[PDB]
Amino acid sequence: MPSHFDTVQLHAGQENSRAVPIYATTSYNPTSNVLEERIAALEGGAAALAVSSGQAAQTLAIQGLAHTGDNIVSTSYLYGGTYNQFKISFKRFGIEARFVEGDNPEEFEKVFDERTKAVYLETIGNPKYNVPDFEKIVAIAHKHGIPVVVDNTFGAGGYFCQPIKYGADIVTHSATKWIGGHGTTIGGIIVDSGKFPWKDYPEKFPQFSQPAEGYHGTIYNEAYGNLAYIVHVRTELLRDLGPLMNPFASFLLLQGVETLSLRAERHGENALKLAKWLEQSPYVSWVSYPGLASHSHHENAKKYLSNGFGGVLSFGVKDLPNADKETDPFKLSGAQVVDNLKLASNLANVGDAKTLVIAPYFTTGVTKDLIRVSVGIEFIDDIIADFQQSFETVFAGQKP
Amino acid sequence: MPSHFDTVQLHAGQENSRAVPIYATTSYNPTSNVLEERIAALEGGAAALAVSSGQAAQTLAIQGLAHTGDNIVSTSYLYGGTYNQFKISFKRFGIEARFVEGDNPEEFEKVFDERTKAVYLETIGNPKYNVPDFEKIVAIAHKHGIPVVVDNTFGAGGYFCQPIKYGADIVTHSATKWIGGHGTTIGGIIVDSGKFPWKDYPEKFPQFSQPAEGYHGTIYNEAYGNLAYIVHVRTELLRDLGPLMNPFASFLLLQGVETLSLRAERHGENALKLAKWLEQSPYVSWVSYPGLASHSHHENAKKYLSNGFGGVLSFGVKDLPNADKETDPFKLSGAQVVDNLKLASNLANVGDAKTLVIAPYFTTGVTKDLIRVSVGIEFIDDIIADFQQSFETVFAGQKP
Amino acid sequence: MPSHFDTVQLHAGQENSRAVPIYATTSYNPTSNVLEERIAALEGGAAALAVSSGQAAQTLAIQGLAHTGDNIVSTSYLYGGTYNQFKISFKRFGIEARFVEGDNPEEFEKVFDERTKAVYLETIGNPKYNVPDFEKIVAIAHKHGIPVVVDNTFGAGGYFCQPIKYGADIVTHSATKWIGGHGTTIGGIIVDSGKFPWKDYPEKFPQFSQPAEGYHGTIYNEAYGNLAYIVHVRTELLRDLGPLMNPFASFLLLQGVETLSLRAERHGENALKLAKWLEQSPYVSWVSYPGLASHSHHENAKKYLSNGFGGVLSFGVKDLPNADKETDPFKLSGAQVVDNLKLASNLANVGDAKTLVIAPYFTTGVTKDLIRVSVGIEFIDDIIADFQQSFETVFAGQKP
Amino acid sequence: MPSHFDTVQLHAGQENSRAVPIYATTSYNPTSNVLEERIAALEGGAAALAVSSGQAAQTLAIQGLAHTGDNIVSTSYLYGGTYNQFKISFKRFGIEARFVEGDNPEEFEKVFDERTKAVYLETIGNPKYNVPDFEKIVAIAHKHGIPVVVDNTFGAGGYFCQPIKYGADIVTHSATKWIGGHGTTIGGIIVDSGKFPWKDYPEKFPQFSQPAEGYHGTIYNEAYGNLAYIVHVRTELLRDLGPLMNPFASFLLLQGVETLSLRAERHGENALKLAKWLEQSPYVSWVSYPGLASHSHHENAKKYLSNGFGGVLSFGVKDLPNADKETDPFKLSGAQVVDNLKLASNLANVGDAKTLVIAPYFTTGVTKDLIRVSVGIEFIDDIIADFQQSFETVFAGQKP
Ligand SMILES: *Cc1c(COP(=O)(O)O)cnc(C)c1O
Ligand SMILES: *Cc1c(COP(=O)(O)O)cnc(C)c1O
Ligand SMILES: *Cc1c(COP(=O)(O)O)cnc(C)c1O
Ligand SMILES: *Cc1c(COP(=O)(O)O)cnc(C)c1O
């Protein structure tokens, strides 16, 4: 299970002061550059760009492809923060999001036209935890000269999945999650594979083909070759729109990256064990996790993930007797179970070293019985023991 | 000079640990909140929002007003980065920037239609340091139901000018400059006056009057009344597009604010004394600074600024013999003066406590003789002596 | 009023990235070195050393001179924490502190013996704010081959007093106070004049004259000449005993240093004005401030202080009716006034930009009527008004 | 391998903002408080104190036991910096360090007298990695009423050893090393088991028995019972002597602790494998690591360590021809091996996630051939391959 990734996450971008300085300066960012190269190296990309958040990394990524009058094609299985960004905020920019339920390859193609500037996927989709069929979707997007953008947040900076290996062109990360690993720092990363042939599609992507008025009349394809996309995103979009990552955030996230494979491995082993334990528990109706045999999209998971199946799972708790008669929400077995955990923390992030839970129906396909768990790196027996005592307290004196 | 500003910059938002904790967390920003409240109070606004840069402040401020198909109307006296942002970047979003030379208010009205969603000004415009006629431009924009957005970066956090006092609706700052004060930290702020009556223009500004699909069906005008703009910018745009200020940035900027009035006063007084001296120098051909009586906009400057005239001036250095015959740039007198400076630092920021100079034709009204100076809070005799010794070097073996 | 000091506090040690990096590194401090060189220049010293606290700066400074069996001679007008340090902690190290009273030099001579390794002064002593007669005490210490160590904390980093200019050998600072300026960061500085002739006293100070076994047999006097003291303190004491300043602290203190003269000037000016105003107040029995003619050591203050008289003052509030008939402490006017302050903050620090108060008799001569103010840089009229409204409340229904 | 240590390292001290705020304040440290409770829980201690560095932790730890005229008794197998501290700087304090070669209990006893205030040991001693016989040495120390102080730095925060379970009284750490884990942050920890019965030695330890003049006449043994040591060290020594830990360092170290078990396990496993590999190399003359069967102390090591044998090893490289005629020491083989390493970094720290090497003859038992290696958590094959390619280069064109 140890591999070269362990070396890369400590050395890529550090060429020759051993720790990298916080260049807290406006004027002459080396700290962000190390981070960028390291995540590039871990993803199997050519270059990367750091921005102030996951949401910013997704925003710039798409705005570097699509302009007013354009469209993008996305899975409907969206991290809920991405869904509003797409359907609502992007619409105010004249960018139309088109959603393909299920991920039959020919369903994608039926909404393609010449104004389609990206296909957008998530490595592990919220909230059915389906892994996309990267090869089929990439073949069909590339056939029509459309680049593929993948949110690989749940791939933990490349540890569980490197979608560039399966043909993805652009990868985005909420580094806020597993890359940082400690719930201290918000950040995003955009990674360019450097393999999408912009030159073949000068009319679809004029931003790389035509002199850039905003950058000394540079033709990005001529001046930067295969890095045209990421250079344009840096020199025009980041410059003009300004979601830059603070060097202190760059520093903290570099600290996390140094232990990424160790943390992620443990997150995955703990999540698979917790998911298996929940599934056999008499308190639980169902569990959703990509590493369970019972998972529908397990075939893709097995093919495209490695070293495990991600840090996150969902499960439903069985009802208290008199389930639907109870007029009060908070008194339902899901919210109760969350309120009685002592180890797990009730809050909305994922990718902390600490185990985190949320019961969606009660604050933020959301049923009342549903608990989402970002599984931490605590001792698995204490994690399980925490759920068990919560179940016990909630179903107090009353078989499961 | 001392005023209640001195008290506010230390106490607004810390009404109730004596220093403000850096809450480097993702999950449950309070440092950001103190900064926002403090800049709001100094500018006389109702509320504010901190974001990752000045560029982002301007981007979100406009994107909270204008959607694709809309237009905005702007002075053409723009900060370099605002120009490309407006001309090139906003165009990709379907927002048309209409530029209007001079500060005749009839030039503004000329280019209004009912899809005009903002008028945009700079308190002290670049590169000629023109202060606009706030009263007249506001009057005419408000007549047509159009809100006025003012980049008050050169007003130093409200110290040299509070555009809201003259009817501005929205104020944006590069907090990177004088607010921070030390060249360490990038950051932006948006300040809402809360005096623009969104309710009276339900169709020009649908984002405040129609149910927000991306925010639980809320009608911002109904739920948040006079704070509809700023709440929308926060809960929709900031959330979806993601240019968040890091808490370490919030923290350092808060430290700068606490001395803003002390610093800005000294920047003002030093700039004026440098300007007057350059105006008597045999080595100078012209000087541009709003507090000089010879400046074309000296009247507006006197009426809308107070406590001084800002920290930035430009001047032209006398030509050396063979100036147009000279083919090589670096031997032009401007580049040579900048090269021989010892105290001043050659870089592009403004608003550092250190004095900074740039000869924009020899790096980035961009004529060959032109030196721009952001005048620092060094002892004035040391700043002057620095220019003097360089002039002497550059022009040696001649007659001043 | 402005002087070269304003240039020095921005430029010294920044030799040739505009801001100084945070080198958060164990291995290869540069940030620290800038702070050191800058405070040395501000104090007219040859070199300096940064350490984790004012208490650490005092400890190492003394342990750089005195060993077990030795004594030092100190004013008894000690900041509270220095007294315990000296009388109690130093004793466990076999260093005996001898406390001399008043300013008279002859009393100094009487307790001097061949094992006296230092004389210790404070620039403004607690809590009577008496300034020492530097010239007489230095003359009589130097006659006996004894160096003078001065805690110049209340000197505000050289702004109000540079004791080295009156012959002091070694100056220490709690940089926690005026040097940082914001109550955020704890730190200490030791400054060496480089002017004490260690070579003339090889027996009194063997640590500079005998091969140092702890440092490869170096004789500090030969290898480092006039810097023997500070090099010995760095390379032996800091190394072995370990009170090192973290580079983040170094960074924040440097930011404060950049406005030192502006803050200190305002603190001094506001304290004098407050002091005068309290004196004429009929709620006030007495006022102690070095810049009042009423002060007993006024003449030392005017000879050795410049640009003002420090940031700190004490005063007595007149008794309420039933003065000695109150056996409840908290009903006395002193405590009542601090509780009804709205702008001032009640805590034990000095040197914050904000106004700080304490009634030491009701938590930390220390009489029942006494309030200690560290006067901030708020608008003076707001500070005064805060006292008045407090007075009026406490004395409501009763004459001044 | 995974255990409860994994939960404790995440949760101890964070009872109920999910991330710990950085309280950068001088006035009212909770960040340090979390780190102290955590390291105490990981060591099996009652309480702990954070200080500016490991050197400071060792200094205050001893100064809280021994006063002028006292002695302590110490292994001779000391980390370099400790030896100078003990032999030289402590002597200036009137504390005599009595060094006891070897690890026979009885040799400790022969230098005990009634002024012996500590026995000081190291978990893995330098420079030959000997583990002391804890049980035997604690029994003879405690028989004479002497507390045992253990530098457990190389125990990695309790992961490889918890000396308190073997009867140690006080444990110190350089948290600079594995606790922190990234070479970013300097710090120390003192841990008190709360088991040493101070009340039975009121004259050997008057600091806990006699009213404390430096702290309100308190008798630590009465007011604080079994926590008298750690409270006296905090409220008197830390307060007067001032080696405070900055909250930024607290925060960074807390982040490191959250991955301690995962890092330390990989360090231990990587060192053992590198050790074994070195043992099959034709370029190596000897290897020293506690986990090898050939190590002199292998039995103590097996008894008192667990989960591995620590992260550091040393070895000696064969000479190149003409050792003795070489007059440039950078042309010797140990130096050349270090110079040709690509992955390993040449510097003095240990306990970084990166592999570090030093050949101490060429910089800081120190012989020509010695390389010390702090083995990092890179992929072991990369680490081995680095040494191999280095040997291949240095000894190119030769017999092996
Ligand atoms: C958290 C998250 C995001 C948004 O990231 P931020 O850094 O919080 O802006 C987007 N993608 C995935 C799948 C996420 O989990
Ligand atoms: C610097 C500047 C900007 C841009 O702000 P950043 O914080 O550098 O993104 C905006 N307008 C003015 C006038 C500024 O000087
Ligand atoms: C605050 C103070 C000290 C102690 O400094 P710390 O940085 O608080 O350890 C010493 N001397 C003076 C006069 C003080 O004001
Ligand atoms: C590094 C170290 C120390 C000294 O700690 P610092 O944090 O460098 O002051 C002492 N003991 C051990 C064994 C060491 O490894």
Short mmCIF file of C-alpha atoms and ligand atoms in Angstrom, two decimals, chain A residues 26 238-242 244, chain B residues 51-58 78-82 85 120 122-126 151-154 172-178 185-189 312 348-351 372, ligand 2:
data_model
loop_
_atom_site.label_atom_id
_atom_site.label_comp_id
_atom_site.label_asym_id
_atom_site.label_seq_id
_atom_site.Cartn_x
_atom_site.Cartn_y
_atom_site.Cartn_z
CA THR A 26 1.70 41.90 -1.80
CA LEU A 238 -7.55 35.08 -11.53
CA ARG A 239 -6.03 38.51 -12.17
CA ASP A 240 -9.35 40.17 -13.16
CA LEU A 241 -11.73 38.34 -10.77
CA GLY A 242 -9.35 37.99 -7.83
CA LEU A 244 -6.60 34.37 -4.66
CA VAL B 51 -13.48 39.13 0.16
CA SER B 52 -10.18 37.82 -1.10
CA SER B 53 -9.01 40.88 -3.07
CA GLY B 54 -9.91 44.32 -4.34
CA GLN B 55 -10.51 42.77 -7.76
CA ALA B 56 -12.97 40.32 -6.21
CA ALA B 57 -14.71 43.17 -4.34
CA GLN B 58 -15.32 44.94 -7.63
CA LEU B 78 -9.76 53.54 -14.17
CA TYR B 79 -7.14 51.70 -12.25
CA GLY B 80 -5.36 49.50 -14.83
CA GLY B 81 -6.79 46.21 -13.58
CA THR B 82 -10.35 47.60 -13.37
CA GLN B 85 -11.80 43.56 -15.79
CA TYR B 120 -19.02 53.28 -11.26
CA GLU B 122 -13.16 56.18 -8.41
CA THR B 123 -12.69 58.66 -5.56
CA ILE B 124 -9.31 59.64 -7.00
CA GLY B 125 -9.04 58.38 -10.58
CA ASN B 126 -5.99 57.11 -12.44
CA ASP B 151 -13.99 52.47 -5.58
CA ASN B 152 -12.84 54.38 -2.52
CA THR B 153 -9.47 52.66 -2.37
CA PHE B 154 -7.59 55.99 -2.64
CA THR B 172 -15.49 49.00 -2.66
CA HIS B 173 -11.91 48.94 -1.37
CA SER B 174 -8.69 47.25 -2.17
CA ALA B 175 -7.85 46.71 1.48
CA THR B 176 -4.47 45.57 0.17
CA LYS B 177 -3.50 49.27 0.00
CA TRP B 178 -3.83 51.86 2.81
CA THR B 185 -2.00 41.25 2.88
CA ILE B 186 -4.38 41.16 -0.09
CA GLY B 187 -8.07 41.72 0.63
CA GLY B 188 -11.21 43.47 -0.61
CA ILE B 189 -14.26 44.99 1.03
CA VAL B 312 -0.19 59.23 -4.61
CA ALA B 348 3.74 48.40 -8.41
CA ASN B 349 1.73 48.47 -5.13
CA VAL B 350 0.46 51.67 -3.56
CA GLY B 351 -0.51 52.26 0.05
CA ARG B 372 4.28 57.62 -10.10
C1 LIG E 2 -4.95 47.79 -6.10
C2 LIG E 2 -6.21 48.34 -6.60
C3 LIG E 2 -7.31 47.56 -7.01
C4 LIG E 2 -7.31 46.05 -7.00
O1 LIG E 2 -7.24 45.47 -5.66
P1 LIG E 2 -6.36 44.11 -5.32
O2 LIG E 2 -6.56 44.00 -3.78
O3 LIG E 2 -4.90 44.34 -5.77
O4 LIG E 2 -7.02 43.00 -6.18
C5 LIG E 2 -8.51 48.21 -7.19
N1 LIG E 2 -8.60 49.54 -7.36
C6 LIG E 2 -7.64 50.31 -6.86
C7 LIG E 2 -7.71 51.78 -7.08
C8 LIG E 2 -6.45 49.72 -6.40
O5 LIG E 2 -5.34 50.49 -6.25
#
